[PDB]
Design a protein around this ligand. Structure first.
Ligand SMILES: *[C@@H]1O[C@H](CO)[C@@H](O[C@@H]2O[C@H](CO)[C@@H](O)[C@H](O)[C@H]2NC(C)=O)[C@H](O)[C@H]1NC(C)=O
Ligand SMILES: *[C@@H]1O[C@H](CO)[C@@H](O[C@@H]2O[C@H](CO)[C@@H](O)[C@H](O)[C@H]2NC(C)=O)[C@H](O)[C@H]1NC(C)=O
Ligand SMILES: *[C@@H]1O[C@H](CO)[C@@H](O[C@@H]2O[C@H](CO)[C@@H](O)[C@H](O)[C@H]2NC(C)=O)[C@H](O)[C@H]1NC(C)=O
Lengths: 93, 49, 44
């Protein structure tokens, strides 16, 4: 409370550093002669690859990497030029 | 105010914040906005023209 | 669609996509306005 009104204390996160990652807009998967694409269902998540060539997803508000699963992707027919090429073995479990 | 508006306009194409002035095409930003509106499912038949 | 395959689209823009089992929630009852189907016709 304040004279004829009120005061708000807002608590916010202040970043002091940034993590740099190599992000892909989708995965072009070639299962034999069947070429299709996989895109991240949630547009708020960024997809990248770790040292062990395992796909990970992180939010852009905070760096909280998590392992990517098949349920996080949507299958489409075409592929984009900026998609990372992969086979069935390299796809997330 | 003019510097503020110019910086706001230029921040759209800025790819990273921790280094130099690395830029991305404006069409890529437009495509990201479109995906935010609705998840695009026709990658081949893009019609941004 | 024409091939009796279920599809999902947002209402803001027409962007049809194939429907998977992870997009559905299972409940006990059924509604009158539900489409009848068997196990074979369910999305993969
Ligand atoms: C965030 O802060 C942590 C903690 O200071 C940093 O982790 C340090 O990283 C340096 C450089 O690799 C290491 O020598 C230290 O041992 C790390 N400290 C700890 C406690 O793990 C981290 O690098 C920072 N993140 C950045 C700069 O992006
Ligand atoms: C992923 O694979 C695709 C398909 O083979 C590659 O796209 C080819 O790129 C070459 C080199 O620029 C072009 O000459 C071909 O016309 C492209 N083919 C198609 C079908 O578009 C793409 O370069 C690969 N990406 C890599 C290896 O990073
Ligand atoms: C889907 O199947 C249900 C269950 O059999 C059908 O519901 C029946 O509809 C008839 C005709 O109106 C009613 O007499 C029955 O009482 C209903 N049964 C139940 C259990 O509610 C429904 O009509 C079917 N929908 C179709 C074929 O489009």
């Amino acid at each position: 409370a304040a004279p004829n009104g009120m005061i708000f204390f807002h608590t916010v996160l202040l970043p002091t550093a940034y993590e740099t990652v190599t992000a892909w807009s989708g995965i072009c998967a070639s299962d034999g002669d069947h070429t299709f694409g996989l895109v991240v269902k949630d547009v708020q998540l960024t997809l990248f690859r770790n040292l062990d060539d395992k796909f990970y997803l992180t939010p852009r508000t905070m760096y909280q990497p998590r392992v990517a699963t098949i349920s996080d992707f949507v299958q489409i027919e075409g592929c984009d030029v900026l998609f990372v090429n992969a086979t069935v073995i390299e796809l997330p479990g | 105010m003019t510097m503020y508006t110019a910086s706001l306009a230029g921040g759209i194409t800025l790819g990273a914040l921790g280094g130099g002035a690395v830029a991305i095409p404006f069409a890529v930003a437009v495509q990201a906005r479109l995906n935010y509106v609705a998840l695009q499912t026709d990658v081949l038949n893009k019609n941004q023209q």
